Known about the structure:
The protein is α/β, with parallel strands linked by helices.
Amino acid sequence: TPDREKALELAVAQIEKSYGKGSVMRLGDEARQPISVIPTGSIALDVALGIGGLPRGRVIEIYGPESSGKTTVALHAVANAQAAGGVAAFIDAEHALDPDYAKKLGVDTDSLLVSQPDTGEQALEIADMLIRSGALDIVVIDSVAALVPRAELEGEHVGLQARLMSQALRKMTGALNNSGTTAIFINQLRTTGGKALKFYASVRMDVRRVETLKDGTNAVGNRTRVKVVKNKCSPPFKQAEFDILYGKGISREGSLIDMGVDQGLIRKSGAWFTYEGEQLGQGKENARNFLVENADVADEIEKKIKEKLGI
């Protein structure tokens, strides 16, 4: 129906105009690639997000159970944002951060601004102050659930934690868009996904442990799964798997191999992984180990995956 196709295009454009880009997409669409994004530390996840990383100037939510990897994911966003010359902040109401781990996976913890605020509103106001400066590239709020309202802490009104977020998220959303600063809210499952946060966030990611990685006999890490349940920057509902190795973090090299074979850029002659006629290793671990020992080939593979895809 040629007469229908135009009407459909028109309707889509009218929606796209009056509510902003990404208000409607076909799930098979290619993503519109931004100038800069914050890579996540896994290329598989970067591809699931469409735009190759987390968007700038937007509210991001990352949630999952305890021991899920959601904080690891947020810490890689901090590492990479820093690695590109950015400044980072970490508003903490959990008191759980491990800086040694943070450092190993790549965070410049010395330069990391940290705040341990007294109330939930103090946390968001301080976040807003930092954002409105224009000097921050990323701010992580850990976590939504821990943000206790002042009235409740002072003894003095029941569901005003929801009223608190709504108020602040409206104010914060404008501040983030102007500054180009990404705000990451970490949230726990067992509030569930915020309430206001669920609707203000441009990207929502659901993070979970799938299975224990076998280090011969002992556990060296976890296979992690992430579904992008909400995505205003690129078609949603895509998922990715990657490895989080204890003490090291997300195995970048492991994820290059996974997306490597997925995209045909890496072939398999039996248990051997092959790239460009050369061999990477027998089994996944040798191939992974090879790529960390050979940064140049890992970057070449990373380059070729991005190019074959959107970016």
